[PDB]
């Protein structure tokens, strides 16, 4: 996963090197989230840039929302097996 | 897949002329046959003791309950109920049960007036998911028709990997035959006849 | 000059359970699709 | 005057036309050739698909038409055929297994399947007794889907055979098919449960042996010939003419089939 | 010596595989080798006539086993000797239908992919594609 690698790299930079990520670093992360279609990570990064940095590139925020609404139309908002109704004795504990 | 196979796999399409209408017609006939066997013999015809429409009954109920609005009283769940409240509950329960059986599903009203027991609430939740799922499936099956993509489901498979994995060709070829046939067949029944 | 190989021995065909894409069409057909996968695995183990 | 009934079940028009030409040229017009969809006697069925009205699907290895590869082999493959309904309607072989899952009552269907299996079992044991074998081999597809039809098939076939005093050995579809194609001399009588895979196995055996004609025993009581290729159909017609009481014509057709399989009509 | 003895017993049916797997051409090729037929034939010459005949018959039957049951039923109806030509013609007809259905360039790519899947030599694949193209016109 590209997102995991970059986040770990940022963790190393801020914690084990004492360097504050700038706007450029977060923009790269947001671009990766948009490119990969992971629209839920984009929301979290969007708030991070709106909190630490000054806002988010509005181009990327709109792109993420478009991906999210595509999932709603296609129904891939959450993994389906989660939506399946279960019960006390209807759950398979591997 | 060790061993040079004698033939290259090709799609099993041999019934070139397969109209969607015929496939759905056959599905409808099979669906009707299974339904007839499952349900039972169609119940004996029963003559109504009176003639009246559902809309007329609902209007009469609304008129009856409208005149007592000023008299009608406010109560908690654990407090005892009044005559007006009891009449309203019974009438609305019957009305919305009839509507649910007929198919005019208003899940909010059904939830308020027909749902009194925990088990019944569970059943309502089961119904709510099914209707939404069917609506989504029909919409995408129609949009997939607009896309022109294979109506039937297609598994997420990489046959080049399967070819490598399997020692013998025969099971691999058979699997492709089934899925190719499945992806080429529409799994729909005419809902007009089903409702009828 | 010790044992070389058991020509009789054959590596069993490792079966992989078929995966279906997670759409609404799959949830409606979850039971039916699962049955197909079970049939596929049974065919692979036995051979046909 | 006499009539031969041609049934078509999944056969290409070329095979049917070839069969019609063969009978017309050989018979000479004495016996007419009418086409239909069901018959009990004096019937030839062309095509892999099983016709309507047949309960047993026996096939053997005729001595005359033995391929040099399979010279001397002697094994009888009998496929049990359940009653066939209309194409649109759900077939019994599938209804007997799906209705149970759906919870629908399956009493009448079980009774019909039981009757068909008993008749097929009686045919199989009669062939086994005639050949002198002591044990027969039951073939059941081991798929999880067919966990009910096969179970009834085993429960009834073994019951009838054991009542007759012979032994039964149950096996699957892949192992028996490989054995029948590679080492068929180790099997004397093999019964097959009613499944699509078994039908393909029966056709493969009938073809690999060199092309033969399958015998179908119907509900009305009798034997009807069945073919799927030019040679198999030609042999089926030859046997049918022999049944009508024509020996020289039957021999000529058999000789033509042996010499020129794909063009028997011109060969004779 | 042991390999030939094991192969002879295996074909004769005396010796079964570990899991009682069917004795098909594919499995034998996997274990004994691509050219098991040639070495077995040479070895059989050091055996009496009866064993030689059995080896030849078993080898021929195994070669017929190289096809699936469905293919044998569909194509082997008019004898085994004519099976290969009938199967080749049916495959060629499928190729023609594929070409007429979805062009040629896709057919070329599809044939290449299947040949890679089907363990086909480039020469055989090139011959097949040329034959089907010629048959088209």
XYZ file of C-alpha atoms in Angstrom:
743
model
C 0.000 0.000 0.000
C 1.424 3.362 -1.028
C -0.596 5.192 1.629
C 0.784 3.061 4.463
C 4.381 3.594 3.351
C 4.033 7.374 3.151
C 2.291 7.656 6.522
C 5.014 5.561 8.155
C 7.607 7.794 6.497
C 5.892 10.862 7.954
C 5.793 9.186 11.369
C 9.550 8.639 11.180
C 10.142 12.239 10.111
C 8.040 13.907 12.809
C 8.799 11.606 15.753
C 12.248 10.080 15.198
C 13.690 13.108 13.366
C 11.783 16.102 14.813
C 10.695 17.635 11.503
C 7.231 19.052 10.900
C 5.638 17.919 7.614
C 4.792 20.840 5.351
C 1.864 21.356 2.985
C 3.655 19.562 0.147
C 3.929 16.283 2.054
C 0.228 16.187 2.924
C -0.774 17.079 -0.637
C 1.106 14.030 -1.906
C -0.787 11.850 0.572
C -4.118 13.336 -0.498
C -3.272 12.761 -4.163
C -2.490 9.107 -3.439
C -5.784 8.648 -1.590
C -7.692 10.188 -4.502
C -5.759 8.166 -7.075
C -6.259 4.876 -5.221
C -9.990 5.473 -4.727
C -9.737 5.261 -0.921
C -12.256 8.007 -0.233
C -12.418 7.521 3.544
C -8.718 8.177 4.103
C -9.127 11.307 1.992
C -11.642 12.691 4.475
C -9.188 12.210 7.342
C -6.290 13.753 5.410
C -8.612 16.574 4.366
C -9.202 17.466 8.016
C -5.486 17.132 8.792
C -4.623 19.702 6.133
C -7.498 21.888 7.330
C -6.119 21.579 10.889
C -2.315 21.687 10.650
C -1.955 23.234 7.192
C -4.295 25.873 5.722
C -7.118 23.998 4.050
C -6.873 21.447 1.263
C -6.443 21.807 -2.505
C -10.098 22.183 -3.456
C -9.388 20.202 -6.628
C -8.584 17.111 -4.557
C -11.446 17.553 -2.083
C -13.941 17.555 -4.951
C -12.271 14.543 -6.568
C -12.583 12.551 -3.343
C -16.275 13.410 -3.010
C -16.851 12.277 -6.593
C -15.254 8.922 -5.771
C -17.403 8.582 -2.649
C -20.658 9.258 -4.498
C -19.653 6.804 -7.220
C -19.477 4.130 -4.522
C -22.932 5.108 -3.275
C -24.350 4.675 -6.779
C -22.517 1.370 -7.254
C -23.168 0.348 -3.640
C -19.510 -0.091 -2.634
C -19.752 2.233 0.364
C -18.885 -0.546 2.829
C -17.828 -4.178 2.399
C -20.983 -6.185 1.880
C -20.359 -8.949 4.409
C -20.591 -6.315 7.147
C -24.122 -5.401 6.049
C -25.282 -9.021 6.282
C -27.571 -9.544 9.254
C -26.146 -11.834 11.932
C -27.121 -13.289 15.290
C -25.710 -14.705 18.493
C -25.334 -18.190 16.981
C -25.149 -17.026 13.342
C -21.545 -15.742 13.514
C -18.677 -17.986 12.395
C -15.814 -17.447 14.849
C -12.778 -18.765 12.982
C -1.417 -28.135 -16.769
C 1.572 -30.318 -17.635
C 0.894 -31.920 -21.006
C 0.128 -30.252 -24.326
C -3.643 -30.009 -24.550
C -5.314 -31.107 -27.809
C -7.585 -28.061 -28.195
C -7.580 -24.369 -27.328
C -10.394 -23.323 -25.019
C -13.085 -21.275 -26.748
C -16.355 -19.852 -25.413
C -19.103 -22.501 -25.304
C -21.414 -20.150 -27.191
C -23.145 -22.479 -29.657
C -26.752 -21.327 -29.228
C -25.932 -18.106 -31.043
C -29.545 -16.867 -31.099
C -30.515 -16.315 -27.443
C -33.029 -13.490 -27.100
C -33.310 -11.973 -23.632
C -37.094 -12.344 -23.838
C -36.955 -16.134 -24.178
C -34.552 -16.515 -21.253
C -36.725 -14.362 -18.992
C -39.816 -16.242 -20.182
C -38.258 -19.570 -19.199
C -37.189 -18.146 -15.843
C -40.749 -16.941 -15.260
C -42.189 -20.357 -16.113
C -39.759 -22.105 -13.761
C -40.464 -19.537 -11.049
C -44.218 -20.052 -11.408
C -43.835 -23.834 -11.270
C -41.764 -23.715 -8.084
C -44.117 -21.210 -6.446
C -47.146 -23.379 -7.196
C -45.464 -26.423 -5.667
C -44.243 -24.562 -2.576
C -47.257 -22.490 -1.528
C -50.008 -25.067 -1.949
C -53.293 -25.318 -3.820
C -54.766 -21.888 -4.495
C -57.180 -21.256 -1.611
C -60.895 -21.696 -2.308
C -62.636 -18.593 -3.595
C -64.339 -16.599 -0.838
C -67.181 -14.180 -1.520
C -66.930 -10.846 0.257
C -69.771 -10.251 2.690
C -69.790 -6.595 1.594
C -68.428 -4.434 -1.214
C -66.026 -1.627 -0.320
C -62.681 -0.318 -1.536
C -59.570 0.043 0.595
C -59.482 3.773 -0.148
C -63.108 4.126 0.944
C -62.372 2.252 4.174
C -59.362 4.464 4.890
C -61.425 7.595 4.256
C -64.166 6.317 6.564
C -61.592 5.573 9.273
C -60.115 9.058 8.938
C -63.581 10.608 9.169
C -64.422 8.536 12.248
C -61.180 9.452 14.017
C -61.317 13.123 13.003
C -64.427 13.964 15.005
C -62.881 12.760 18.275
C -59.588 14.654 17.951
C -60.646 17.251 20.526
C -61.804 14.529 22.923
C -58.716 12.394 22.312
C -56.177 12.462 25.119
C -52.421 12.266 25.703
C -50.944 9.238 27.471
C -47.562 7.662 28.131
C -46.549 4.171 27.044
C -47.075 2.700 30.520
C -50.300 4.580 31.273
C -53.659 2.980 30.454
C -55.187 3.775 27.083
C -58.501 5.344 26.096
C -61.292 4.086 23.864
C -60.303 6.435 21.041
C -56.666 5.346 21.235
C -57.609 1.658 21.210
C -59.925 2.092 18.230
C -57.266 4.046 16.350
C -54.617 1.420 17.060
C -56.793 -1.496 15.950
C -58.043 0.215 12.792
C -54.625 1.481 11.714
C -53.019 -1.883 12.483
C -55.495 -3.724 10.268
C -55.279 -1.120 7.498
C -51.497 -1.175 7.334
C -51.340 -4.967 7.597
C -53.587 -5.179 4.538
C -51.417 -2.634 2.736
C -48.249 -4.553 3.621
C -49.668 -7.805 2.265
C -50.861 -6.075 -0.903
C -47.422 -4.506 -1.439
C -47.937 -0.780 -0.700
C -44.971 -0.786 1.669
C -44.726 2.430 3.675
C -42.078 1.360 6.153
C -42.587 4.338 8.485
C -46.341 3.838 8.874
C -45.988 0.054 8.972
C -43.391 0.520 11.693
C -45.597 2.771 13.799
C -48.949 0.997 13.510
C -48.227 -2.684 12.747
C -45.048 -3.308 14.759
C -45.719 -4.087 18.429
C -43.462 -7.069 19.268
C -39.642 -7.399 19.197
C -39.827 -10.373 16.820
C -42.123 -8.418 14.510
C -39.627 -5.539 14.533
C -36.863 -7.949 13.511
C -39.042 -9.177 10.648
C -39.695 -5.589 9.556
C -35.952 -4.952 9.449
C -35.557 -8.067 7.311
C -38.200 -6.778 4.895
C -36.630 -3.318 4.677
C -33.257 -4.644 3.517
C -34.799 -6.929 0.895
C -36.794 -4.208 -0.870
C -33.836 -1.830 -1.020
C -31.557 -4.602 -2.278
C -33.972 -5.488 -5.081
C -34.280 -1.830 -6.078
C -30.501 -1.430 -6.256
C -30.106 -4.692 -8.172
C -32.723 -3.710 -10.750
C -31.203 -0.253 -11.221
C -27.687 -1.573 -11.812
C -28.918 -4.452 -13.966
C -30.621 -1.774 -16.060
C -27.550 0.471 -15.988
C -25.417 -2.566 -16.817
C -27.785 -3.060 -19.752
C -27.007 0.541 -20.684
C -23.352 -0.417 -20.266
C -24.027 -3.549 -22.315
C -21.910 -5.665 -19.965
C -22.831 -9.291 -19.208
C -26.045 -9.318 -17.214
C -25.180 -12.335 -15.098
C -22.561 -12.147 -12.354
C -18.909 -12.587 -13.283
C -16.416 -13.958 -10.723
C -13.133 -12.192 -10.009
C -10.810 -14.775 -11.561
C -7.529 -14.774 -13.495
C -7.701 -17.888 -15.652
C -4.029 -17.597 -16.747
C -3.166 -18.270 -13.103
C -5.703 -21.101 -12.918
C -4.173 -22.682 -16.021
C -0.774 -22.663 -14.314
C -2.108 -23.991 -11.008
C -4.180 -26.933 -12.234
C -2.310 -30.103 -13.148
C -5.096 -31.204 -15.520
C -6.848 -29.131 -18.180
C -10.262 -30.785 -17.903
C -11.491 -29.200 -14.630
C -10.165 -25.804 -15.741
C -11.994 -25.983 -19.069
C -15.210 -27.117 -17.388
C -15.067 -24.198 -14.951
C -14.649 -21.717 -17.802
C -17.561 -23.323 -19.655
C -19.885 -22.885 -16.676
C -18.925 -19.285 -15.895
C -18.945 -18.261 -19.560
C -22.421 -19.767 -19.896
C -23.516 -18.130 -16.638
C -22.245 -14.701 -17.684
C -24.131 -15.150 -20.980
C -27.520 -15.888 -19.359
C -29.962 -13.415 -17.806
C -31.316 -14.499 -14.410
C -34.622 -12.620 -14.432
C -38.290 -13.585 -14.131
C -41.181 -11.472 -15.396
C -42.415 -9.659 -12.294
C -45.855 -9.004 -13.799
C -46.683 -12.715 -13.838
C -44.997 -13.243 -10.463
C -47.109 -10.511 -8.875
C -50.171 -11.910 -10.641
C 22.407 -45.718 -4.716
C 19.421 -44.902 -2.506
C 15.759 -44.245 -3.286
C 15.219 -41.801 -6.156
C 11.496 -41.002 -6.392
C 7.997 -42.462 -5.989
C 6.528 -42.228 -9.483
C 3.252 -43.409 -7.942
C 3.061 -40.319 -5.730
C 1.210 -37.389 -7.290
C 0.820 -33.883 -5.813
C -2.856 -33.319 -5.130
C -4.447 -30.484 -7.143
C -4.551 -27.597 -4.691
C -8.059 -26.070 -4.918
C -8.673 -22.344 -4.544
C -12.153 -21.179 -3.583
C -13.624 -18.955 -6.288
C -14.120 -15.311 -5.296
C -16.995 -13.085 -6.412
C -16.933 -9.301 -6.566
C -18.702 -7.607 -3.651
C -21.695 -5.906 -5.258
C -25.387 -5.854 -4.395
C -25.922 -8.609 -6.961
C -23.595 -10.822 -4.915
C -25.426 -10.212 -1.633
C -28.756 -11.170 -3.203
C -27.134 -14.310 -4.646
C -24.777 -14.975 -1.723
C -26.218 -18.422 -1.011
C -26.391 -19.383 -4.687
C -22.850 -18.194 -5.412
C -21.527 -20.001 -2.338
C -23.117 -23.217 -3.580
C -21.374 -22.833 -6.931
C -18.017 -22.367 -5.206
C -18.594 -25.463 -3.073
C -19.518 -27.440 -6.189
C -16.409 -26.129 -7.949
C -14.140 -27.223 -5.097
C -15.803 -30.644 -4.919
C -15.276 -31.091 -8.660
C -11.615 -30.091 -8.366
C -10.929 -32.547 -5.538
C -12.694 -35.510 -7.149
C -11.696 -34.518 -10.686
C -14.932 -33.916 -12.585
C -46.617 -50.077 -45.246
C -44.448 -50.510 -42.161
C -43.224 -47.419 -40.313
C -39.912 -46.345 -38.796
C -40.163 -43.488 -36.293
C -37.299 -40.976 -36.326
C -36.846 -38.905 -33.162
C -34.562 -35.857 -33.160
C -32.956 -34.756 -29.873
C -30.147 -32.254 -30.347
C -29.010 -33.744 -33.666
C -27.756 -31.617 -36.541
C -29.844 -31.670 -39.708
C -26.965 -33.321 -41.580
C -27.172 -36.491 -39.480
C -30.960 -36.676 -39.824
C -30.724 -36.153 -43.585
C -28.049 -38.851 -43.800
C -30.224 -41.286 -41.843
C -33.227 -40.581 -44.075
C -31.146 -41.127 -47.216
C -29.683 -44.378 -45.866
C -33.057 -45.906 -44.988
C -34.665 -44.782 -48.252
C -31.834 -46.161 -50.393
C -31.530 -49.448 -48.490
C -35.180 -50.188 -47.698
C -36.270 -49.204 -51.205
C -39.590 -47.693 -50.112
C -41.213 -50.828 -48.683
C -41.136 -49.331 -45.166
C -42.012 -45.663 -44.738
C -39.969 -43.368 -42.493
C -42.021 -40.938 -40.402
C -40.682 -38.328 -37.982
C -42.001 -37.777 -34.458
C -40.897 -36.923 -30.916
C -41.863 -40.069 -28.970
C -42.232 -43.770 -29.739
C -42.155 -47.178 -28.097
C -41.116 -49.501 -30.918
C -39.486 -49.372 -34.352
C -37.896 -46.064 -33.355
C -34.465 -44.550 -33.969
C -33.430 -41.483 -31.955
C -30.686 -39.237 -33.342
C -28.724 -36.854 -31.149
C -26.950 -36.758 -27.784
C -30.046 -35.467 -25.988
C -32.228 -38.061 -24.280
C -35.701 -38.440 -25.858
C -39.024 -38.451 -23.986
C -40.362 -41.834 -22.918
C -37.177 -43.816 -22.129
C -36.314 -45.245 -18.709
C -33.232 -47.372 -19.464
C -30.199 -46.417 -21.559
C -28.263 -49.651 -21.992
C -25.264 -49.922 -24.307
C -22.903 -52.791 -25.085
C -19.880 -53.628 -27.251
C -21.139 -55.433 -30.382
C -18.745 -58.104 -31.603
C -19.041 -57.176 -35.285
C -18.261 -53.468 -34.816
C -15.420 -53.842 -32.302
C -12.586 -51.421 -32.958
C -9.156 -53.088 -33.230
C -8.033 -51.139 -30.157
C -10.942 -52.509 -28.082
C -10.973 -56.044 -29.495
C -12.304 -58.621 -27.044
C -13.684 -56.159 -24.488
C -17.089 -57.025 -23.024
C -18.696 -54.503 -20.667
C -22.310 -53.323 -20.461
C -22.978 -49.701 -19.487
C -26.587 -49.059 -18.443
C -27.662 -45.494 -17.668
C -30.822 -45.007 -15.619
C -33.067 -42.371 -17.220
C -35.755 -40.674 -15.166
C -39.011 -39.592 -16.830
C -38.476 -36.538 -19.020
C -40.880 -33.597 -18.898
C -41.143 -30.629 -21.245
C -37.946 -28.597 -21.767
C -39.405 -25.574 -19.969
C -40.556 -27.623 -16.975
C -38.085 -28.548 -14.252
C -36.656 -32.010 -14.841
C -37.108 -34.657 -12.165
C -33.361 -35.167 -11.732
C -33.099 -31.519 -10.646
C -36.497 -31.201 -8.960
C -35.776 -34.133 -6.640
C -32.752 -32.262 -5.236
C -33.856 -28.609 -5.274
C -37.343 -29.013 -3.794
C -35.898 -30.741 -0.731
C -33.646 -27.729 -0.164
C -36.610 -25.388 -0.675
C -38.707 -27.476 1.730
C -41.336 -28.407 -0.859
C -42.965 -31.817 -0.559
C -41.167 -34.461 -2.627
C -43.385 -37.534 -2.302
C -44.709 -38.026 -5.839
C -41.311 -37.217 -7.351
C -39.616 -39.722 -5.038
C -42.162 -42.359 -6.055
C -41.544 -41.707 -9.753
C -37.772 -41.789 -9.256
C -38.054 -45.002 -7.236
C -40.016 -46.690 -10.023
C -37.478 -45.622 -12.653
C -34.512 -46.823 -10.588
C -36.190 -50.168 -9.895
C -36.766 -50.742 -13.613
C -33.190 -49.726 -14.426
C -31.871 -51.937 -11.622
C -33.913 -54.878 -12.919
C -32.464 -54.374 -16.403
C -28.921 -54.139 -15.032
C -29.188 -57.290 -12.912
C -30.713 -59.185 -15.828
C -27.746 -58.240 -17.999
C -25.353 -59.152 -15.181
C -27.025 -62.535 -14.696
C -26.982 -63.179 -18.448
C -23.273 -62.341 -18.664
C -22.588 -64.270 -15.447
C -20.899 -61.477 -13.485
C -21.316 -61.483 -9.702
C -20.766 -57.788 -8.909
C -21.928 -54.628 -10.666
C -20.453 -51.135 -10.416
C -22.717 -48.225 -9.508
C -21.641 -44.784 -10.733
C -22.779 -41.705 -8.805
C -21.451 -38.176 -9.179
C -19.978 -37.128 -5.833
C -20.879 -33.438 -6.134
C -22.467 -31.853 -3.077
C -25.370 -30.594 -5.197
C -26.402 -34.143 -6.140
C -26.480 -35.305 -2.523
C -30.130 -36.451 -2.672
C -30.770 -37.987 -6.100
C -27.652 -40.152 -5.820
C -28.527 -41.153 -2.251
C -31.911 -42.454 -3.395
C -30.248 -44.080 -6.410
C -27.815 -45.976 -4.183
C -30.483 -46.863 -1.616
C -32.715 -48.414 -4.285
C -30.166 -49.899 -6.695
C -28.295 -51.706 -3.918
C -31.583 -52.879 -2.395
C -32.803 -54.424 -5.652
C -29.420 -55.917 -6.568
C -28.864 -57.381 -3.100
C -32.389 -58.799 -3.231
C -31.337 -60.455 -6.495
C -28.188 -61.788 -4.799
C -25.416 -59.898 -6.622
C -22.873 -57.477 -5.169
C -22.613 -53.731 -5.776
C -19.561 -51.453 -5.725
C -20.205 -47.703 -5.614
C -17.813 -45.318 -7.378
C -17.667 -41.754 -8.657
C -17.644 -40.362 -12.179
C -14.023 -39.440 -12.946
C -12.407 -42.670 -11.742
C -14.905 -44.910 -13.539
C -14.689 -42.867 -16.745
C -10.893 -43.129 -16.798
C -11.056 -46.858 -16.053
C -13.706 -47.457 -18.717
C -11.654 -45.660 -21.376
C -8.252 -47.075 -20.354
C -8.932 -50.481 -18.742
C -12.529 -51.479 -19.552
C -11.957 -55.244 -19.280
C -12.028 -54.954 -15.467
C -15.704 -53.880 -15.502
C -18.489 -56.267 -16.462
C -21.684 -54.323 -15.745
C -21.739 -50.642 -14.782
C -24.918 -48.771 -13.877
C -24.959 -44.974 -14.081
C -27.169 -42.611 -12.114
C -29.154 -40.017 -14.060
C -26.836 -37.008 -14.390
C -25.534 -34.947 -17.294
C -21.970 -36.116 -16.639
C -23.050 -39.763 -16.798
C -24.756 -39.121 -20.139
C -21.517 -37.698 -21.543
C -19.593 -40.703 -20.212
C -22.019 -43.085 -21.919
C -21.629 -41.214 -25.213
C -17.838 -41.178 -24.893
C -17.741 -44.936 -24.295
C -20.136 -45.571 -27.184
C -17.885 -43.515 -29.464
C -14.430 -44.593 -28.313
C -15.316 -48.261 -28.833
C -15.604 -47.428 -32.539
C -19.156 -46.143 -32.841
C -22.126 -48.194 -31.628
C -25.898 -47.914 -31.266
C -27.377 -47.485 -27.796
C -30.539 -49.333 -26.759
C -33.292 -47.449 -24.933
C -35.956 -49.318 -22.972
C -39.162 -47.280 -22.783
C -42.077 -47.238 -20.362
C -44.415 -48.878 -22.884
C -42.079 -51.880 -23.062
C -39.653 -52.374 -25.918
C -36.295 -51.390 -27.359
C -35.507 -48.374 -29.542
C -32.185 -47.642 -31.224
C -30.168 -44.491 -30.578
C -27.269 -42.894 -32.411
C -25.353 -39.628 -32.423
C -22.856 -39.872 -35.326
C -22.939 -41.116 -38.910
C -21.567 -44.554 -38.026
C -23.593 -44.900 -34.823
C -26.801 -43.856 -36.590
C -26.049 -46.237 -39.460
C -25.594 -49.101 -36.996
C -28.788 -48.056 -35.211
C -30.712 -48.161 -38.498
C -29.174 -51.534 -39.362
C -30.300 -52.987 -36.032
C -33.759 -51.465 -36.491
C -34.106 -53.003 -39.957
C -32.963 -56.338 -38.523
C -35.713 -56.086 -35.903
C -38.287 -55.465 -38.642
C -37.087 -58.717 -40.228
C -34.509 -57.607 -42.807
C -31.206 -59.486 -42.566
C -29.464 -58.837 -45.892
C -30.202 -55.107 -45.736
C -28.976 -54.937 -42.137
C -25.726 -56.693 -43.060
C -25.137 -54.332 -45.989
C -25.623 -51.270 -43.779
C -23.324 -52.740 -41.125
C -20.641 -53.456 -43.728
C -20.974 -49.947 -45.168
C -20.691 -48.437 -41.685
C -17.547 -50.462 -40.982
C -15.898 -49.417 -44.255
C -16.871 -45.747 -44.744
C -18.146 -44.231 -41.472
C -18.867 -40.648 -42.544
C -20.225 -41.442 -46.041
C -22.085 -44.732 -45.627
C -24.945 -43.544 -47.845
C -22.643 -43.181 -50.853
C -20.549 -46.200 -49.836
C -23.475 -48.632 -50.080
C 14.736 -50.364 -14.948
C 12.436 -49.470 -12.060
C 10.792 -46.627 -13.993
C 9.867 -48.861 -16.931
C 8.629 -51.594 -14.589
C 6.523 -49.076 -12.669
C 5.127 -47.607 -15.892
C 4.221 -51.040 -17.269
C 2.382 -51.958 -14.068
C 0.685 -48.549 -13.996
C -0.630 -48.880 -17.552
C -1.651 -52.502 -16.957
C -3.645 -51.341 -13.919
C -1.677 -53.464 -11.448
C -0.093 -50.343 -9.918
C -2.264 -47.423 -8.804
C -1.286 -43.849 -8.058
C -0.872 -42.724 -4.459
C -4.302 -41.058 -4.319
C -5.937 -43.457 -6.813
C -5.953 -40.604 -9.313
C -7.078 -41.458 -12.860
C -4.320 -42.806 -15.108
C -4.474 -40.074 -17.737
C -1.897 -38.933 -20.262
C -1.454 -35.654 -18.382
C -0.493 -37.293 -15.080
C 1.932 -39.745 -16.703
C 3.636 -36.930 -18.614
C 3.954 -34.993 -15.355
C 5.768 -37.810 -13.542
C 7.598 -39.986 -16.058
C 8.360 -37.314 -18.650
C 7.335 -35.721 -21.932
C 8.664 -38.664 -23.983
C 7.454 -41.508 -21.755
C 5.885 -43.146 -24.815
C 9.179 -43.429 -26.705
C 11.203 -44.891 -23.832
C 8.399 -47.301 -22.925
C 8.161 -48.523 -26.522
C 11.916 -49.132 -26.646
C 11.777 -50.949 -23.303
C 8.817 -53.085 -24.389
C 10.939 -54.616 -27.163
C 12.803 -56.567 -24.451
C 9.560 -58.352 -23.488
C 7.552 -61.242 -24.963
C 5.063 -60.609 -27.740
C 2.010 -60.613 -25.463
C 3.448 -57.879 -23.243
C 4.486 -55.879 -26.314
C 0.931 -55.994 -27.672
C -0.501 -54.961 -24.296
C 1.928 -52.039 -24.054
C 0.965 -50.831 -27.534
C -2.748 -51.153 -26.770
C -2.437 -49.367 -23.423
C -0.382 -46.563 -24.980
C -3.010 -46.057 -27.684
C -5.800 -45.962 -25.093
C -3.853 -43.463 -22.973
C -3.427 -41.195 -25.997
C -7.192 -41.330 -26.523
C -7.503 -40.367 -22.844
C -5.794 -37.038 -23.622
C -9.227 -35.585 -24.486
C -11.968 -34.664 -22.049
C -15.120 -36.756 -21.768
C -17.239 -34.092 -23.470
C -14.827 -33.837 -26.403
C -14.763 -37.617 -26.838
C -18.558 -37.866 -26.786
C -18.976 -35.021 -29.279
C -16.146 -35.888 -31.682
C -15.374 -39.603 -31.187
C -18.836 -40.749 -32.277
C -17.568 -42.158 -35.592
C -14.558 -44.036 -34.224
C -11.271 -43.180 -32.505
C -9.137 -43.225 -35.650
C -11.206 -40.326 -37.026
C -11.299 -38.491 -33.684
C -8.273 -36.264 -34.281
C -9.457 -34.910 -37.633
C -12.979 -34.303 -36.320
C -11.645 -32.472 -33.262
C -9.326 -30.368 -35.424
C -12.172 -29.441 -37.774
C -14.444 -28.457 -34.882
C -11.692 -26.322 -33.347
C -11.066 -24.667 -36.717
C -14.785 -23.947 -37.070
C -14.750 -22.313 -33.635
C -11.790 -20.209 -34.742
C -13.650 -19.091 -37.863
C -16.697 -18.139 -35.800
C -14.490 -16.223 -33.364
C -12.799 -14.345 -36.216
C -16.104 -13.444 -37.867
C -17.459 -12.328 -34.477
C -14.702 -10.122 -33.013
C -12.282 -9.284 -35.794
C -8.791 -10.664 -36.360
C -6.335 -8.692 -34.222
C -8.247 -9.684 -31.091
C -8.352 -13.242 -32.436
C -4.580 -13.165 -32.947
C -4.098 -12.024 -29.352
C -6.644 -14.551 -28.079
C -4.954 -17.405 -29.949
C -1.583 -16.343 -28.542
C -2.931 -16.247 -24.983
C -4.602 -19.649 -25.303
C -1.448 -21.138 -26.825
C 0.496 -19.843 -23.827
C -2.206 -21.349 -21.613
C -2.477 -24.494 -23.746
C 1.259 -25.342 -23.817
C 1.298 -25.051 -27.612
C 4.459 -24.633 -29.650
C 4.718 -21.331 -31.562
C 4.885 -23.244 -34.850
C 1.660 -25.120 -34.101
C -0.092 -21.909 -33.057
C 1.138 -20.132 -36.188
C -0.040 -23.027 -38.356
C -3.475 -23.027 -36.714
C -4.012 -19.280 -37.092
C -2.905 -19.426 -40.728
C -5.241 -22.352 -41.430
C -8.282 -20.643 -39.905
C -7.474 -17.403 -41.733
C -7.194 -19.307 -45.015
C -10.469 -21.113 -44.309
C -12.233 -17.778 -43.793
C -11.379 -16.795 -47.374
